[PDB]
Design a protein around this nucleic acid. Sequence first.
RNA 1: AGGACCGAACCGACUAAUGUCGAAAAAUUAGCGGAUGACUUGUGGCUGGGGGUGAAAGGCCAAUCAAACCGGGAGAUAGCU
RNA 2: GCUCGCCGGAAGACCAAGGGUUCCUGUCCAACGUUAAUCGGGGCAGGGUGAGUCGACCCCUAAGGCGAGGCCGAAAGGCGUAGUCGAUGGGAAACAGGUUAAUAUUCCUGUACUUGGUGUUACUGCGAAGGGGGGACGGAGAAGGCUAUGUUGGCCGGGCGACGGUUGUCCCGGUUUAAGCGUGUAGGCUGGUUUUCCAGGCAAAUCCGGAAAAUCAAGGCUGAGGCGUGAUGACGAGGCACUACGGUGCUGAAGCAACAAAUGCCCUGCUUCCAGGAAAAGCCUCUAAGCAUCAGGUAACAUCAAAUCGUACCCCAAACCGACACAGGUGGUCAGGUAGAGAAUACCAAGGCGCUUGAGAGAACUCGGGUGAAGGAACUAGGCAAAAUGGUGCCGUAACUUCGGGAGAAGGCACGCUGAUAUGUAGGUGAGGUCCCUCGCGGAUGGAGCUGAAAUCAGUCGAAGAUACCAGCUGGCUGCAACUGUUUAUUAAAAACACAGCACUGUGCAAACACGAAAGUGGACGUAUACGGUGUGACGCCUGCCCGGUGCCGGGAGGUUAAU
RNA 3: AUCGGGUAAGUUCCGACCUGCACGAAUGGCGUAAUGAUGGCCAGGCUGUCUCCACCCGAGACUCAGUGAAAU
RNA 4: CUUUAAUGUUUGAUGUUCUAACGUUGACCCGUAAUCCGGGUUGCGGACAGUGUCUGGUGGGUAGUUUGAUCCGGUGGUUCUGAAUGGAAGGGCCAUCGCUCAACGGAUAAAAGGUACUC
Lengths: 46, 260
Amino acid sequence: MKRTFQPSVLKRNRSHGFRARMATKNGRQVLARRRAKGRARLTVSK
Amino acid sequence: AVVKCKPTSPGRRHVVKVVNPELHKGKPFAPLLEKNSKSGGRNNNGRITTRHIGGGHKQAYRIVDFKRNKDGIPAVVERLEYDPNRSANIALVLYKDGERRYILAPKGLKAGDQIQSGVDAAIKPGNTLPMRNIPVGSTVHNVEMKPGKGGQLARSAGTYVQIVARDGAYVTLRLRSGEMRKVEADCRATLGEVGNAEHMLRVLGKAGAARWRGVRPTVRGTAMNPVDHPHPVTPWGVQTKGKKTRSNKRTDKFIVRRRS
RNA sequence: AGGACCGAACCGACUAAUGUCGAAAAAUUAGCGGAUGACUUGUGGCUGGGGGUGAAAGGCCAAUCAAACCGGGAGAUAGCU
RNA sequence: GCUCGCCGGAAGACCAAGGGUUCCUGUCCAACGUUAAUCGGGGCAGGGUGAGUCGACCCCUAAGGCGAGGCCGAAAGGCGUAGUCGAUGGGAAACAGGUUAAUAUUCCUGUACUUGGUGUUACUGCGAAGGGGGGACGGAGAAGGCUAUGUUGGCCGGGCGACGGUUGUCCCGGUUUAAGCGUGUAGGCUGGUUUUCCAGGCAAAUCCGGAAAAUCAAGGCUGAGGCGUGAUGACGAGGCACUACGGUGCUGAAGCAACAAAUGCCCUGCUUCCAGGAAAAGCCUCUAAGCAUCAGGUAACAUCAAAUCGUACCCCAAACCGACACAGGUGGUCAGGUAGAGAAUACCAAGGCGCUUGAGAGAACUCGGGUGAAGGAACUAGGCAAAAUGGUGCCGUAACUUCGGGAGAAGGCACGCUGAUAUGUAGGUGAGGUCCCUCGCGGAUGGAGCUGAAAUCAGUCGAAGAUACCAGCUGGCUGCAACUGUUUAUUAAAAACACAGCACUGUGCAAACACGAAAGUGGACGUAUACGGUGUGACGCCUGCCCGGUGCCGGGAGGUUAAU
RNA sequence: AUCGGGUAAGUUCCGACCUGCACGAAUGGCGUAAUGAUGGCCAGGCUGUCUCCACCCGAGACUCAGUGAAAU
RNA sequence: CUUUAAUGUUUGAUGUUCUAACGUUGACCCGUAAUCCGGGUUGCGGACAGUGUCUGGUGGGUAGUUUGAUCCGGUGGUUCUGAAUGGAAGGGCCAUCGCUCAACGGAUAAAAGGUACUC
């Protein structure tokens, strides 16, 4: 069978990238929470 | 013409085709074409507002002129073409000045026929004339409710309306639905009845015809679970099967008689 | 010409066997139905939770669905173990 | 190193996506490899990815996203115009050989090509977010020309050979050469030249479109392949001299003809079908504003530049997704020889592997198979599973039927090899010579040569000649459903769901209906032959009675009836 | 969804009647060619399904060497 | 004052007509290389439609639940008190009355079923 996760860099970036998140305020709030938690990997990117 | 296919197999046993030998067997007129992206029943919100719509073969929109603003310009019918968007065949019309357009083809129209729009037009089929000039008791198609609107009544194949009464600046039209409507005299209309009146004879044969014509399968209410469907009422709870949904109170002044 | 016929790739799993702390959190062998379409597939998007989609099984919604997951009310309440 | 076995429409070679150095060398077995390991996709060090011609990048755009003003909404925010993004598409260009342990269409050798800037020369009107053409398109199907490719023959170099014969009609290997350039053919499309005029192409126009005429009947566009140059160059079997014995250098003969032939090109071609089959940009052309002693454009020459990013490695797998070095899944391209209708099947070439535990013995029992005395379903919920037929050609094929089907019904006979018909037939292809030629890739005769079924007779060996793999069991009765098809991913594939048809009902178009606090959308750039809902489910007979209760429609006689 | 056929033997199946608990005419009734990985029955062949199992070929099972879990 | 009538007044229900509010998903022009939107002209309806508050009816479509006691008080008498003073309303004191609210120590004034999809 084919598992749920089929990697695709373009789709991953466009669905969870910084620009995609910040296009809306909710993603900006998520980024703010991530920064407050101090995660080194703020988002998914190369 | 109407033909019945031999029962060489199921799916052709009951097929009845409507063949029009004089239709153009070639590419359409590119300048008047326009792309028509299918919607699949979705709206701006992307949800299915109307069901049973989807799939189908790609079809390019034909820019069919209905207002017929070319007044006093005689034109010749070059040929007839099939319009997937309309149930009736279209006609290519070339004017004297050297401009081509698409018009609704009435029953008595063929290649090489002469047409003329505007108030100064004859009574031959295909001409456009206001109901004030048109004699009472005549058959017209592609009628307008407002001057310059373009035409909204009797646009399908073999569809026509009857001019019954002339009350001053208004005219009474009996429609194919048995409805009497009052329309302003300044509006435009086309004489004759739309062509390809044999549209009923087609039966589509099998599921695939409807599937690729742009209709998806319909699921009966009984087969649906109580959560999905109320099961006579509509899926949204409205009592169908003999309940009037006409609530306008704005155009009722133009309503003379309701269907019977 | 054929939602035609037999049958490869492809799609799915109708039967039997093995596999249930297995090679696999539904797998493998031979048979099996379609195989020019109402077929399938690569890519990119749209439809987001009392909602989406559904040729409609209460089916699917990231191995979880008669109401997903994540954080909060919340140390909800439990005459019960 | 030599044997034995497997894949070979792959278990081979390229890639796309996905990984991020796993790629090569040196060095070690601390931990990993389900055992050992000197080995490795393990540990440490070094090296490795060269682009105007590949792709990304960049111009345009579909689905779709954002969205200046604007509409709407308590706020957040939702819709959307102009615009901007968005390849899954359209746009300019390279081929052959050689080389490292790792790069090559990037490096070297040879021959080229494409886009712009600058300068010279000779001419000339240029000039757009604007107009016109093209770009620019569906399904199915047949033929012809070809080609990649393979077979044979001639030619070249070698061999005559350890178990009988093999200088002979014998055996082994090669017999390759691109892009570009010129000729432009098979084929396909279209009638051209000139003049005059027109409220059409949201202004104009020499451009398109339309209307008139005079003239010829040919011209114009597209177009695979082949032919010469590219190329007396590279490559090339084999031999020769040294080997850190892995390997390096020199040399180098022939490099042709016929046949067959593709899913690949002519072919976005041609013939038919209704389901009527993207858009924009580059590209050619016309002018508006503005300038026309300029600027700008055309044609030839010389020169400059074409930047930046990835270029290793795996890519049906040990490297990607499955927690694994996992019997699972993963898109495209090339894909040969014999038999075979076939990309099936049996064995092989090229190329790649023997799948990371084995050595003994051959107990019961388990897993997958082979055989079997006699019966042949007597075992079993149930012919579950097993067993059996299975192909080509010829004869023949019932009941019913919507006349198509049932049907490959059922049921009967020949299939091997050799000679003759025929020192290989029919058929296909087809040289040289001869004759014409509107003179070359032109047309007739001719059959050289090559390829080559099918059928009859006769003979012949075997128990069996569709001798292997591949390869329907058959008929009758009968309920269901018209049929094809889809469904509970991961126990239920069905009588269930769906379906073309049928009937009712609603909707007059700012239509009904649905998403929406509203805007605005789908319906529909459709409109009563149209769309939504309901019920049944082809076709024939049909669909009988009932309006009391609940809905729906219409009514207003008379009573009740809130806000006010 | 009682009588006869099929077997020597038939609560299944087929055909005939209706004593239709509780079929019935578009939540449709009656037949229907063809179709079905659809439910059931019968007949011809076939055979290890069985009378009744017997032997053989490969991997386990057993012994040795190296590594080396589990539920409880 | 009972009974009538021309005249000027408050006016409303209804009918015909008109445009100036209002709609125009009708047409033309501009912002604008613009199917959005706004503005200028005109035609079409027009005090209709539509919207805002209140209100009658329908409304498993949706949402929360179920499967003489009590509160309320009817009347009385009692100046006990009565929220600045004085009254009144509302409470308190004595009597009586309205429910087999009988599930009769009565949990709400107001509540029926299925789950084999279940937890």
